[PDB]
Design a protein around this ligand. Structure first.
Ligand SMILES: CC(=O)n1cc(-c2c(C)[nH][nH]c2=O)c2ccccc21
Length: 115
């Protein structure tokens, strides 16, 4: 709404992003997928995403509502489910992040709604 201030919202997103990174204990979502190792990655995946890129976007003021932020989190998860076979640790790590990160996101969104 018109009363909603920018700085507390960005502080909330920074904390939330840190909490999400903490759930990724393998740090497999911390940086872009190394395209040098998987030249077919972009065959399947239209828009790569990762937590470092999210941090850059956050600080560049690209996220001004919670949907902006959660959309890129969902990309991290969905890209990983799409690219990796179900029988891999990587696939299961996206499932775990969706669950555990989802709880982080729901509480953070509620904070944003109070602003
Ligand atoms: C998230 C995901 O699907 N992947 C993550 C990696 C990876 C990173 C980001 N660093 N080291 C890695 O192995 C990755 C690599 C190949 C294919 C998918 C990958």
């Amino acid at each position: 709404s018109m009363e909603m201030q920018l700085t507390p919202f960005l502080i909330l997103l920074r904390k939330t992003l840190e909490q999400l990174q903490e759930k990724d204990t393998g740090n497999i979502f911390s940086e872009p997928v190394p395209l040098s190792e998987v030249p077919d990655y972009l065959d399947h995946i239209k828009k790569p995403m990762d937590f470092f890129t999210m941090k850059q976007n956050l600080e560049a003021y690209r996220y001004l509502n919670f949907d902006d932020f959660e959309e890129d989190f969902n990309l991290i998860v969905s890209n990983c489910l799409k690219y990796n076979a179900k029988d891999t640790i990587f696939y299961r790590a996206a499932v775990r992040l969706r669950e555990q990160g989802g709880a982080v996101l729901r509480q953070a969104r509620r904070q944003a709604e109070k602003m």
